[PDB]
Amino acid sequence: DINFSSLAPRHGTRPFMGTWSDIGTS
Amino acid sequence: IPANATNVPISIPSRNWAAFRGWSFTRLKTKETPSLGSGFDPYFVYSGSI
Amino acid sequence: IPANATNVPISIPSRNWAAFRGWSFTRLKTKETPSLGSGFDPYFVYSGSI
Amino acid sequence: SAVTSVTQKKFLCDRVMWRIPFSSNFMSMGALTDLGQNMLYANSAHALDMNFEVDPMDESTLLYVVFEVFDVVRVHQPHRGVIEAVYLRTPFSAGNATT
Amino acid sequence: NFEVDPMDESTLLYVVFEVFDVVRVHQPHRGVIEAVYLRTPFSAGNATT
Amino acid sequence: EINLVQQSMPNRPNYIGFRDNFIGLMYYNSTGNMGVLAGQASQLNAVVDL
Amino acid sequence: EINLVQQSMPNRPNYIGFRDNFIGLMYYNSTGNMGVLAGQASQLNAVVDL
Known part of the structure; x- marks a missing residue:
């Protein structure tokens, strides 16, 4: 906005069966 | 800004102003501002907070 | 070329060499050549022919 | 035995730079303002100026004006041990690199 | 690889790789000028600052 | 006998040390x-750098 | 009496002028x-310019 900071192509995700981080790309 | 000046002249050429955002401004002191035009200034005699 | 070096290897990564023409080469002196790409070279203390 | 007296009143700001947006509403609605997109539409090249009134200083002083632009590097490596970066700044340039 | 005489002074090797530096300059309309620039085997743009 | 009467006061504090995040310790x-x-x-x- | 036998010789010539074709007077x-x-x-x- 007033000073730049717009970035990020990210959301984050954790597959089910617990929270199990990394899906390793789909 | 000369010492005791109450007006500052600004000159900007004819330019396209596409994707221009605001303006920001502040006032400094000459002795507290080093010149970065060269890598050594023999006239920078200030070691305080710049 | 370091002082008194007898060989200087050149490496270049893979490149498409479409529309290339001959190499040309010559030897200069470090003190007699100013740095290019940067305005003002402070270490250039020579004024003879460049 | 209080004497007759008049108010003096003032403010301070420290660590602040004044901000005048370039918006019709004077407020952000995105980093690329709506008046940066109306000079895309048409431009004849306009020339800017300002005046400023600054209080007297016995000391020599400077004015520092920042003109808020976009400075964006796009940077890419196409092959091993190769880096290439294009540098694009928008309304100002002043002999901007790699244009 | 190159081989040269020793010299007490530090020296540089200046190699001109010959290419095509070629520009095409168009004016479509009044007060409009633009160009597309191409360098062939060495990179055509972005490149060195 | 008149140098019995003297006075002394502290020297002014002066704290020296590196800048806010090492400001201007690299040429930028x-x-x-x-x-x-x-x-x-x-x-x-x-x-x-411009 | 022994400064009668001082000897002198000319200072070296040293022609200073502008560059060959105004080389380095503009940034390229x-x-x-x-x-x-x-x-x-x-x-x-x-x-x-690269």
Whole structure:
């Protein structure tokens, strides 16, 4: 906005069966 | 800004102003501002907070 | 070329060499050549022919 | 035995730079303002100026004006041990690199 | 690889790789000028600052 | 006998030490003192400071 | 009496003039100092210096 900071192509995700981080790309 | 000046002249050429955002401004002191035009200034005699 | 070096290897990564023409080469002196790409070279203390 | 007296009143700001947006509403609605997109539409090249009134200083002083632009590097490596970066700044340039 | 005489002074090797530096300059309309620039085997743009 | 009467007061405090985040300990924005990040064997500079 | 036998010899010639064809009087091939030839309404250079 007033000073730049717009970035990020990210959301984050954790597959089910617990929270199990990394899906390793789909 | 000369010492005791109450007006500052600004000159900007004819330019396209596409994707221009605001303006920001502040006032400094000459002795507290080093010149970065060269890598050594023999006239920078200030070691305080710049 | 370091002082008194007898060989200087050149490496270049893979490149498409479409529309290339001959190499040309010559030897200069470090003190007699100013740095290019940067305005003002402070270490250039020579004024003879460049 | 209080004497007759008049108010003096003032403010301070420290660590602040004044901000005048370039918006019709004077407020952000995105980093690329709506008046940066109306000079895309048409431009004849306009020339800017300002005046400023600054209080007297016995000391020599400077004015520092920042003109808020976009400075964006796009940077890419196409092959091993190769880096290439294009540098694009928008309304100002002043002999901007790699244009 | 190159081989040269020793010299007490530090020296540089200046190699001109010959290419095509070629520009095409168009004016479509009044007060409009633009160009597309191409360098062939060495990179055509972005490149060195 | 009159140098019995003297006075002494402290010297002014002066704290010296490095800048806010090591401000101006690397040349930034100074031409002829520019940084370089380039391929080793491709030598395409990719730092430009204005 | 022994400064009667001082001897002198000319200072070396040293011709200073401007460069060969005004070499290095303008910035060429230097980013951050490069020229502009651009329509005054679009700000797109037709100058690319590397």
